[PDB]
Amino acid sequence: GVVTRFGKFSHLVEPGLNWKPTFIDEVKPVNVEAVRELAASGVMLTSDENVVR
Amino acid sequence: PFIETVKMLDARIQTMDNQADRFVTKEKKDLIVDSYIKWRISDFSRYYLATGGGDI
Amino acid sequence: GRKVDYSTFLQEVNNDQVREARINGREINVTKKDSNRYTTYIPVQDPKLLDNLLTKNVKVVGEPPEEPSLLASIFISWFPM
Amino acid sequence: GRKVDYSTFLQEVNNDQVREARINGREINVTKKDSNRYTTYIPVQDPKLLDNLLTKNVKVVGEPPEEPSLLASIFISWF
Amino acid sequence: GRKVDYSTFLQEVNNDQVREARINGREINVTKKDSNRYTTYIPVQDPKLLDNLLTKNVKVVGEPPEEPSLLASIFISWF
Amino acid sequence: KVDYSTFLQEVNNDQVREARINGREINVTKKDSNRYTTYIPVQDPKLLDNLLTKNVKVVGEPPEEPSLLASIFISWFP
Amino acid sequence: GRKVDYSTFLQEVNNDQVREARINGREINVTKKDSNRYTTYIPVQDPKLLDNLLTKNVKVVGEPPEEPSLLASIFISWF
Amino acid sequence: GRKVDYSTFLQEVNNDQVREARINGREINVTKKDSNRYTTYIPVQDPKLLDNLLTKNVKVVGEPPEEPSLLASIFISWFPM
């Protein structure tokens, strides 16, 4: 995670429960660590004037 | 006290199971097979330098 | 906290985008394959819903009921006492 | 407000002039395609509603259940 | 309140003689095309009822959600 | 006081005159004026279908709810 | 009063060795041809139970729902 | 033991690997052939479940309903006196 001081690049926060008191400092929560997927498809021409999926 | 953290790194043998995936033989015939592989971490240093996330 | 539309959720899950669904009553916490989070609400009982999920390899989850604790229940009941 | 009939509602849904549908219990908060608005009530349990809604791209909304606050309830249970 | 039986209601619908009805609970109060007004009562849950109604092009009306207002009741129970 | 399955057997051969139903019970009104009581074991989807197949007159009637005056009684008599 | 599994109960009924089936709530008090008796519970609501009974030609016995009791309320609220 | 998703449970049963099952409203205890145990929750009402279980010849049981004793209710409500 990352936390900021009046919208400033600041110490990126270590995982878990961190237990530090700051109010003027704001934390943007999510930077998930996994493996993602984003699929694609369509119909495209060929060099020899054909169509495939 | 609050400026350090540790991550586990499993050392037991691990598995991975594929799914059906196409091939073609020599004589232009198409088969469908499956397989599983047994893997174990060899040296406990280069793993974290190369992987870097310790995620399997 | 983006609350989405039922129709949009069905369209997108049939478009093969979704990976997990935690159902508890009528709220569903959908998590896509792109790791984003949100919630959705079923309109009514949809006899075909459970099928439509499982037949496309989405990983479903069930959640237990919140039983009112007997001690605190009799406390608040006996709080007037 | 403007109250319409569930039946006639079924027919104009068959005639494709509606966009948005919001459902709570039995009510149907509507706004159709041409910005007109109206209201009707789900008579009884229906098997085939959501099919007729979804197959023709009728856009739908549900809204959460209203859970009463416990502290106010116990406080009024005092007196 | 002259009651025409649910079954007889079904056959007379088969005879296509009713104009409309407004549905509440399992009580069916109904207005039929010969200007007559009566009522009947639903025996048990009937799936096919609405389907047959739709096939008959008959008009059907829901009734707004009946509700016992929980304002007087609480304090009169404390009265 | 009579068997359900026998009741179905009996409705197959069309000796029922009228079907007067209320709640989970049916009092039997057949051709030969014999009367009795039958109990529904569990929800049956076909019962209505079976009866409607054989043109029997089938009536149900609204409930007899407990009187509110007695409700107030039970509320304050103790 | 021995408990016997639902699966075994189906294993018996589908092979027609039972006559007496007592239905109440979701309990079944079972009696076969040997006057031997036991009890079992139906785990869920099943549409195919009664059909399975009727087809294999086994007789039924069902009885009235338990009228509620007042006496507990009598004592607790009245004393 | 590890509580498991419903989809995993169905993939498992479809391979004839669950031995005994207990049903309580929507909570289930499961025992595999390999003598392990865990718990599962049925998200939404399912008509096709039970037959699917039966066809793959799995041992299915039920449990008694827990009726609270009226004397216990009298005790709790009499706690003022």
UniProtKB/Swiss-Prot annotation, chain A:
Organism: Escherichia coli (strain K12)
Record's subunit section: HflC and HflK interact to form a complex, originally called HflA, now called HflKC. HflKC interacts with FtsH; complex formation is stimulated by ATP, and with YccA.
Additional remarks: Integration of this protein into the membrane depends on SecA, SecY and SecD but not on SecB or FtsY. HflK is unstable in the absence of HflC.
Function noted in UniProt: HflC and HflK help govern the stability of phage lambda cII protein, and thereby control the lysogenization frequency of phage lambda. HflKC inhibits the SecY-degrading activity of FtsH, possibly helping quality control of integral membrane proteins.
Record-given protein name: Modulator of FtsH protease HflK
Family stated for the protein in its record: Belongs to the band 7/mec-2 family. HflK subfamily.
Locations listed in the record: Cell inner membrane
Curated annotation (Swiss-Prot), chain B:
Subcellular location: Cell inner membrane
Domain of life: Bacteria
Something else known: Integration of this protein into the membrane depends on SecA, SecY and SecD but not on SecB or FtsY. HflC is unstable in the absence of HflK.
Function according to Swiss-Prot or TrEMBL: HflC and HflK help govern the stability of phage lambda cII protein, and thereby control the lysogenization frequency of phage lambda. HflKC inhibits the SecY-degrading activity of FtsH, possibly helping quality control of integral membrane proteins.
Family: Belongs to the band 7/mec-2 family. HflC subfamily.
Quaternary structure, from the entry: HflC and HflK interact to form a complex, originally called HflA, now called HflKC. HflKC interacts with FtsH; complex formation is stimulated by ATP, and with YccA.
Name this polypeptide is given: Modulator of FtsH protease HflC
Originating species: Escherichia coli (strain K12)
Positions spanned in the full protein: 57 to 112 of 334
Swiss-Prot record, chains D, E, G:
Top-level taxon: Bacteria
Coiled coil spans: none
Ranges of the Periplasmic topological domain: 1-70
Knockout mutant characteristics: Lethality, due to increased levels of LpxC, which increases the level of LPS in the cell and results in formation of abnormal membrane structures in the periplasm. Lethality is suppressed under conditions in which LPS synthesis is reduced. Disruption confers resistance to cellular contact-dependent growth inhibition (CDI) CdiA of E.coli strain 536, E.cloacae strain ATCC 13047 and of Y.pestis strain A, but not to CdiA from E.coli strain 93 toxin.
Location(s), subcellular: Cell inner membrane
Misc. comment: The ftsH gene was discovered independently through 3 different phenotypes and received 3 different names: ftsH, for filamentous temperature-sensitive; tolZ, for colicin tolerance, and hlfB, because mutants show a high frequency of lysogenization when infected with phage lambda.
Similarity comment: In the central section; belongs to the AAA ATPase family.
Subunit structure: The E.coli AAA domain has been modeled as a homohexamer, in Thermus thermophilus the same domain crystallizes as a homohexamer. Forms a complex with HflKC (formerly called HflA); complex formation is stimulated by ATP. Interacts with YccA, and probably weakly with QmcA. Can be cross-linked to YidC (OxaA) and to a nascent polypeptide chain for an integral membrane protein.
Protein name: ATP-dependent zinc metalloprotease FtsH
Gene name of the record: ftsH
Residues of the full protein shown: 29 to 107 of 644
